[PDB]
Amino acid sequence: IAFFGIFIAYCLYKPFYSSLLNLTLLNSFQKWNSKRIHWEKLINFVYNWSYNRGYIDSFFKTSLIESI
Amino acid sequence: INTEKLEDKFGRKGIKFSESNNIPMVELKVRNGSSLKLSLSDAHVLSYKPKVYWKDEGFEEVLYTVDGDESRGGVGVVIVNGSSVISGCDWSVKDTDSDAIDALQIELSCTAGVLDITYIVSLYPVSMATALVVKNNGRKPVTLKPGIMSYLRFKKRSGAGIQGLKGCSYCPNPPLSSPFELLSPSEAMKAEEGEKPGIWAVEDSVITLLEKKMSRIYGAPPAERLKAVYNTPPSKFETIDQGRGLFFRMIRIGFEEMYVGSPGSMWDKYGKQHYFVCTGPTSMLVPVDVASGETWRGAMVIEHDNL
Amino acid sequence: PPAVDFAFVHSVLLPDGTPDVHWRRANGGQKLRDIMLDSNIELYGPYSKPLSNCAGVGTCATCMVEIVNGKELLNPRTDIEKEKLKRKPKNWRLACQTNVGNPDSTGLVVIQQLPEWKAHEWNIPKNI
Amino acid sequence: IPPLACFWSKDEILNDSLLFSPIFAIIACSTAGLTAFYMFRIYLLTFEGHLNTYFLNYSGKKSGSFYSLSLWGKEEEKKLTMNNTKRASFFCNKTYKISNNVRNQIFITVENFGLNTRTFYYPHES
Ligand code: FES
Numbered sequence A: 001i002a003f004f005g006i007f008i009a010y011c012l013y014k015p016f017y018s019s020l021l022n023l024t025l026l027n028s029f030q031k032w033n034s035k036r037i038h039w040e041k042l043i044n045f046v047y048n049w050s051y052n053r054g055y056i057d058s059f060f061k062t063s064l065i066e067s068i
Numbered sequence B: 001i002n003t004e005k006l007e008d009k010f011g012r013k014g015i016k017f018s019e020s021n022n023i024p025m026v027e028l029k030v031r032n033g034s035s036l037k038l039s040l041s042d043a044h045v046l047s048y049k050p051k052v053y054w055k056d057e058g059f060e061e062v063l064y065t066v067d068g069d070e071s072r073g074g075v076g077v078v079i080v081n082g083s084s085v086i087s088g089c090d091w092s093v094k095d096t097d098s099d100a101i102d103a104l105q106i107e108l109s110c111t112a113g114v115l116d117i118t119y120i121v122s123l124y125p126v127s128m129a130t131a132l133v134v135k136n137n138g139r140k141p142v143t144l145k146p147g148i149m150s151y152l153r154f155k156k157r158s159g160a161g162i163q164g165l166k167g168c169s170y171c172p173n174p175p176l177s178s179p180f181e182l183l184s185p186s187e188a189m190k191a192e193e194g195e196k197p198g199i200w201a202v203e204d205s206v207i208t209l210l211e212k213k214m215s216r217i218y219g220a221p222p223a224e225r226l227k228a229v230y231n232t233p234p235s236k237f238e239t240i241d242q243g244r245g246l247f248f249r250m251i252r253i254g255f256e257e258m259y260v261g262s263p264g265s266m267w268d269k270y271g272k273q274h275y276f277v278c279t280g281p282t283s284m285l286v287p288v289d290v291a292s293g294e295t296w297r298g299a300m301v302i303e304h305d306n307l
Numbered sequence C: 001p002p003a004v005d006f007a008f009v010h011s012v013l014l015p016d017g018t019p020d021v022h023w024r025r026a027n028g029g030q031k032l033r034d035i036m037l038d039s040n041i042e043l044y045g046p047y048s049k050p051l052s053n054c055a056g057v058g059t060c061a062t063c064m065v066e067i068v069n070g071k072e073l074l075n076p077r078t079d080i081e082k083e084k085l086k087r088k089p090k091n092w093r094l095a096c097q098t099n100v101g102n103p104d105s106t107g108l109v110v111i112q113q114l115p116e117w118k119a120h121e122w123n124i125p126k127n128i
Numbered sequence D: 001i002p003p004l005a006c007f008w009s010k011d012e013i014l015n016d017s018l019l020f021s022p023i024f025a026i027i028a029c030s031t032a033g034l035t036a037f038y039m040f041r042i043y044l045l046t047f048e049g050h051l052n053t054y055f056l057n058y059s060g061k062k063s064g065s066f067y068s069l070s071l072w073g074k075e076e077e078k079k080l081t082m083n084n085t086k087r088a089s090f091f092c093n094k095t096y097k098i099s100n101n102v103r104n105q106i107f108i109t110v111e112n113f114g115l116n117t118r119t120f121y122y123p124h125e126s
Helices: A002-013 A023-032 A042-063 B002-010 C032-038 D008-018 D022-047 D060-066
Strands: B015-020 B023-030 B034-039 B044-049 B076-080 B092-095 B104-109 B118-123 B127-135 B145-151 B169-171 B216-218 B238-240 B247-253 B257-260 B278-282 B295-303 C064-068 C092-094 C110-113
Touching (some): B002 B015, B002 B023, B002 B092, B023 B104, B023 B118, B034 B118, B044 B076, B044 B127, B127 B145, B145 B295, B247 B278, D008 D022
Antiparallel strands (some): B015 B023, B023 B034, B034 B044, B076 B145, B104 B118, B127 B295, B145 B278, B216 B257, B238 B247, B247 B295, B257 B278, C064 C110
């Protein structure tokens, strides 16, 4: 499962000129996922989570310190 | 030693004129140890080794050529109308004093009657620059088709991709008849999965495999006739190696469409090592017709972004 | 058909010294971010990595594009272009927060993609 | 990674986890997979690939700095500054039925220069 995380990060970020993977599979990664419609909500939710800090920062700065 | 005459007339600090086996030749060396083997009187480049790694052996050979045959290997520029215009080997330098040690330039010059083809090969620390410029003199509008065909050797045959011609339509179109070919246009379109005439297909992949014979010209010059937005194809792509971790990029200036040529499995019949690709921009599917006297500028730049 | 004439001038120059314009085609207005994603032009620059964008919602100023002569057929700022980018030359908009409008549209808006990492100033005509 | 890194700690974590309660265990292994995911994401965004800042597709000052002279030498200009609105690309292209081609908008994309702070020293070792 750790090397699965390695592989999922590797196919997304390691560029084509230096990756060790076969270029048929590397082409098929974007060929299977050139839509960005079922990715356009997932990437949105994960980035908004990591950017708004799970909204817990905003909730603490809204109803805990501004409440005080 | 005519190259000695060019050395004590136009030779400079990074410019070394060489004459062995009665072939005039120049080697351009900018400050970071970037080697550029330009065969003089031919407008044909043999070797090109810019500093990719950060060793003393950072220089890496980019263009494909065999050891002996200088006419079979490397990027050579070609001009047709529809016969070969610049086949005369009357190329001579015009000026060399460009910059001291950081950037260099060898511009050649010939004359094909009405066409004054002067021709710039420049060496920047990150880029080869190949620049064609013709100039009409007679009272005839010539309908010429320029061509700059490069042969980029790849260390591993599995590692071949261009990374960025997605979206624009392509057409399998056989290349120009060069005197400096590696594969003829008869065998470049033989035994593929694109058909021989100019069939049209939209590229729906951000990087293309160059494993098969399927060779094409990217862009829509039939759309160019409308002179709307007409979906001008991108002037850049990241050609990759993937055998070792480096890449290169080709930038056209003045041209419209960009050809790639994939040897497929037919690289075994000429060479034995370092699978190549016949890549370059032309004005072929719609030619250029300048004037009864004007000049046309078309440049091509192969650059690396590793250093 | 109603075809808006985007130009999409690239950020870097050509090494010759002239800008390179790409003249994209796509129909009408839904989002400028979706047009620049679909028609294969370089929007984000270095943020084009998969988790390097908010996938269109506007919570990051990563799709910013300088737009010139873009007062004709454009939506106003949705208080996110007004907030994500604040002290700017005021011709800069987020592609995932702007929209060039309705499908029945003709116009010659010209957009300089990546106003960050550029060297040209465009010499804008002074309005009013 | 077992041989040349630290794995036996997390091995003992999940070994003490799965014989405890089934709710807490497979989600702990799932977060371990996520941990490997983002840590390798961090490593790839930092060290693997081109620089994303001196990259000639991206930085315009970089393209202005590498090319101290143009591609033609003594042609096309004595150098050109104040590159105008070249929408037609000096091709004298005529217009069909469209909204507008030219107007009272005369804006020249005046780019920056070359041969000034040209070095841009690459990140050397501390
Ligand atoms: S993609 Fe997040 S800013 Fe438009």
